[PDB]
RNA sequence: GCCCGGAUAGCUCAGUCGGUAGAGCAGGGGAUUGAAAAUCCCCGUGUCCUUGGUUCGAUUCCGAGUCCGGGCACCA
RNA sequence: CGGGGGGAACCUGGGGAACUGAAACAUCUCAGUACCCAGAGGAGAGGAAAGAGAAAUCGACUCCCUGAGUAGCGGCGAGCG
RNA sequence: CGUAGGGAAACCGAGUCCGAACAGGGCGCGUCCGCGGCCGUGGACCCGAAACCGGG
RNA sequence: CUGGUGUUGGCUCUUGGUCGCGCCUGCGUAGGAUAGGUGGGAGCCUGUGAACCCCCGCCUCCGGGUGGGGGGGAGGCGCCGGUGAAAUACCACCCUGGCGCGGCUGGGGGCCUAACCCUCGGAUGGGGGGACAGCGCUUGGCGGGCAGUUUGACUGGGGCGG
RNA sequence: GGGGCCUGACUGCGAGGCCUGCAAGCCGAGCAGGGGCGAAAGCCGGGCCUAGUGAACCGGUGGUCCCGUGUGGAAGGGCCA
């Protein structure tokens, strides 16, 4: 109407099952694309941001409590490497990549915000917020959204997640917005 | 021949044969390989029409056909008849 | 091709309808068969003039009926017929009714636009309806002497 | 110069709509026969031209180098 | 009432060549020339900006001198302008 | 026309062009009229084709 | 000769391409079974009448998949579980192929008559042909029937040869 | 002939000559840039030398201080290759 009306969700009970969907170019040029691993978003959304990180035996204190729950160390590296029906994500600092034991038996991990010692640091807001989704053969898009109690707090994806549109080199025009799920669907410009 | 309405008449034009890649593409450019005189005719057609009593045809270029159905509408407000198929057309302007 | 109809037709009909067609059709069919005419503004405005006239010229005979309704819709007639008992000796057709009502109130009436079946032939109370379109039921009273 | 089509066993060539590599013929042995064919049986041949990549894998999907096959142009 | 036909050139319009030049030749040139037709008149055409073109610009058209063999056009040839 | 040249140009100027360059090197001091020689354009020293085109 | 357009019209049958939208679509191995991808996702469906049985279309890998209509009655699904690369309900963008109506333009096939065209003891009409043919503009092609031309030099004459 | 490091099969210039109707053809010391080999002196602007070539015009690429039809940009030109 005169803007993209989130409070036009006025279909069951507790609503955090709304979404943002779209489409773009198919194998544009020759590679593909990649979303911002947990887009920081102008709202922390107060979500239980499950960070199943890849810390050391030293980051068991504050790698958890920077807007998350559980974090392990060397006890989930080599001990949880032999499990195919049981056993967000930070990254081991400097350069110690996770495909030496944690790619054994496509997931979801870019990195965590820098500090060189802590995670819940002397300035920590962008660390518990919105989601991300990479390629998808046909289309792509497909992200999460927001909570049931939010007037203006839901319209946070106009120049943020719908401006994740910064990894589509060339093909056509990388936008075909269509938001809302588990009830209905509205579609809007960004 | 000529349009009785418009005055249009066959005009003389050239027929130019060319060859070559247009400069605006691959280039070198085109080369006229023969020009020659020829004419373009107006698209003349036939319009039989009732009007007053008598039948009256026009020789007229297709572009101008409607212009006749204008006259027939302008012709209603007139005193006419008197065995005059051709003498109508004349008076039909 | 813009044209205004006359003789209604299939796919395009009731007179005076402006509708668009193939110039070949108009030109080699409708116009020469007088089944429609060019939708020239010359004619188009003359069409407006057929409507604007008749149309409103007909809210006369409609608003004039209600101007005559608001005199007899309430007013009474009263006929001093020469009758015997409850039954009457002669009848009372409208040529009487209409006439009596002229010489009783100075108003003209058609013996035709009534709502009459039989000629009464019977003393009592009756109130018939009039015509056309919206209708005006006049009130009448039957008597003796 | 630019757009098409192709490559799979010795030869000519089929196909998952991403999960099987196959006809036919030549080629070698066996049955038939006065014979040579045509017959009938059995057995060999696979960088599926090339590295990459999508994906749980690929022989068909995509980028690609490559060689032939056409096709349409152009040539101061 | 008009028309018609004539008139040395000159004018406008409708049609419109070739030799030639390019040291051959086709694009190009000769040339919208020659010629044919129609029309006009003492002249004809044109003529009061839906113009020019870079100037707070000029102000119908025609003719002469300039501008200038410049601007350009051109098998960027011949040459045209 | 001449009093200014260089550069394709923007431009700069007794200089300027290439060049990164206080290397090098390239280009960088009358008109008007008469007369005569010659040249270009028009037959252009005179005569001559075979032919081509238009209209009769 | 030929495509496109104009002159050029009615009425049908038939179909393409497209895009609106709405319904389907999917069966390598394991796996309840016919799992299209990626994300949501712990709640939904039912008196906005479910479980169970029959008639009935459509699709098929012949296993089932799915829709209408009848009856009926307060009960169904997912999570869990397990196998897989991916798991289930439900909602989202997302054609892999197919139908169902829409619009937009595209093609054939029929019938018509009134433009055009031929005819008729002369007709504002009657026959026949007929939206083709003819003619305008435009596209490519065939094209000594015709036109304009070109067909080099050296050379113990020219040609031939070189 | 064999080996080692290399890319001077350089960029910007060229005193001066050979040859010579023109236009071409050929040799060139030396200076600057930034290099290569050498301890260095020095040498390197392809190849033991003399054939392996094609003016202009017209286009194509890649560059680029330039031009850009009133102005800003385009279109299209020029310049270098």
The 3-class SS string of chain B reads CCCCCCCCCCEEEECCCEECCCCCCCCCCCEECCCCEEEECCCEEEEEECCCCCCEEEEEEHHHHHHHHHHHHHHCCCCCCCCCHHHHHHHCC
The label of the residue with tokens 């093909």 reads A171
Q: Which residue is nearest nucleotide H60, judged by alpha carbon to C1' distance?
A: B26
Closest Cα to residue A129, out of A37, A21, A36, A39? Answer: A39
Place of tokens 């810390």: A55
Query: Can you list the positions of beta strands (E) in chain A?
Result: 20-21, 178-179
- Tracing tokens 């006419």 back to the chain, one arrives at B80
What is d(CA B61, CA A62) in angstroms, rounded to the nearest whole number? 91
**B73 vs C27, C32, C42: nearest CB:** C42
H-run or E-run covering C3: strand C2-5
Q: How far apart are CA C60 and CA C57, in angstroms?
A: 6
CB A9 within 8 A of CB A146: no
Tokens representing C6 are 């006359």
Q: Both tokens of residue A157?
A: 């994806």
Where does residue A108 fall: left (phi above 0), alpha (psi -120 to 50 degrees), or beta otherwise? beta
Tokens of C140: 């009448």
Positive or negative torsion for Cα A109, A115, A116, A119? negative
* Residues linked to residue C122 through DSSP beta bridges, in sequence order: C87
CB atoms under 10 Å from CB of A185, counted, come to 11
Distances (CA, A) of C13 to C10, C20, C38, C46: 6, 12, 15, 19
B91 beta carbon < 7 A from strand G? no
Task: Give the resolution in Å.
Answer: 3.3
Alpha helices in chain A (DSSP H): none
Task: With beta carbons under 8 A apart, name residues in chain B contacting C40.
Answer: 70, 73
Q: What are the backbone angles phi and psi of residue C38, rounded to the nearest 5°?
A: -35, 130
**Residue A30, CA: closest nucleotide via C1'?**
D63
Cα diameter, chain B: 71
Q: Rounded distance, CA A70 to CA A61, Å?
A: 10
3-state secondary structure of C141: strand
The CA–C1' separation of A26 and G59, in angstroms, is: 31
Q: How was this structure determined?
A: X-ray
- Considering only residues 105-124 of chain A, list those whose CB is below 7 Å from strand D: 106
3-state DSSP assignment of residue C61: helix
Peptide bond into C125 cis (omega under 30): no
Angle at A186 between CA A25 and CA A147, to 5 degrees: 105
Q: For chain C, where are the alpha helices, taking DSSP H only? A: 23-25, 41-72, 94-105
Phi, psi dihedrals of residue C94, rounded to the nearest 5°: -70, -30
Phi, psi of C102 (to 5 degrees): -75, -55
Contact B50 C38 (CB under 8 A): no
Q: Could you give the CA distance from residue B27 to residue B48 in angstroms, rounded to a whole number?
A: 54
Question: B50 and C32 in contact by Cβ < 8 A?
Answer: yes
């Amino acid at each position: 109407k005169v803007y993209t009306i989130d409070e036009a969700a006025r279909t069951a009970k507790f609503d955090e099952t709304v979404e943002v969907h779209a489409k773009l170019g198919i194998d544009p040029r020759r590679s593909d694309q990649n979303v911002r691993g947990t887009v920081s978003l102008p709202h922390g959304l107060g979500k239980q941001v499950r960070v199943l990180a890849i810390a050391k035996g030293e980051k068991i204190k504050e790698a958890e409590e920077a807007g998350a729950d559980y974090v392990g160390g060397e006890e989930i590296i080599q001990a949880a490497a032999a499990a195919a029906a049981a056993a967000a994500a930070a990254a081991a600092a400097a350069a110690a990549a996770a495909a030496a034991a944690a790619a054994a038996a496509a997931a979801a991990a870019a990195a965590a915000a820098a500090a060189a010692a802590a995670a819940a640091a002397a300035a920590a807001a962008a660390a518990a917020a919105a989601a991300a989704a990479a390629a998808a053969a046909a289309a792509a898009a497909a992200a999460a959204a927001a909570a049931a109690a939010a007037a203006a707090a839901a319209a946070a994806a106009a120049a943020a997640a719908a401006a994740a549109a910064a990894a589509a080199a060339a093909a056509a025009a990388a936008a075909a917005a269509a938001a809302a799920a588990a009830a209905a669907a509205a579609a809007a410009a960004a | 021949k000529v349009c009785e309405i418009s005055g249009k008449r066959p005009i003389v034009a050239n027929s130019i044969q060319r060859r070559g890649k247009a400069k605006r593409e691959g280039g070198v450019g085109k080369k006229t390989t023969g020009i020659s005189k020829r004419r373009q005719y107006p698209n003349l057609q036939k319009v039989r029409v009732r009007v007053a009593g008598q039948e009256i045809t026009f020789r007229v270029a297709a572009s101008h056909i409607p212009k006749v159905y204008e006259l027939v509408e302008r012709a209603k407000g007139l005193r006419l008849e008197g065995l005059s198929p051709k003498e109508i057309k004349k008076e039909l302007l | 091709m813009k044209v205004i109809l006359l003789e209604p037709l299939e796919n395009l009909g009731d007179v005076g309808q402006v509708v668009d067609v193939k110039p070949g059709y108009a030109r080699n069919y409708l116009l020469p068969r007088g089944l429609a005419v060019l939708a020239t503004e010359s004619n188009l405005k003359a069409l407006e003039a057929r409507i604007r006239a008749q149309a409103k010229r007909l809210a006369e005979r409609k608003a004039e009926a209600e101007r005559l309704k608001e005199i007899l819709e309430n007013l009474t007639l009263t006929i001093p017929v020469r009758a015997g008992e409850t039954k009457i000796y002669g009848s009372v057709t409208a040529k009487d009714i209409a006439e009596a009502l002229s010489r009783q109130h100075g108003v003209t009436i058609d013996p035709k636009r009534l709502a009459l079946e039989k000629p009464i032939k019977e003393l009592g109370e009756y109130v018939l309806t009039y015509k056309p379109h919206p209708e005006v039921p006049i009130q009448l009273k039957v008597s003796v002497v």
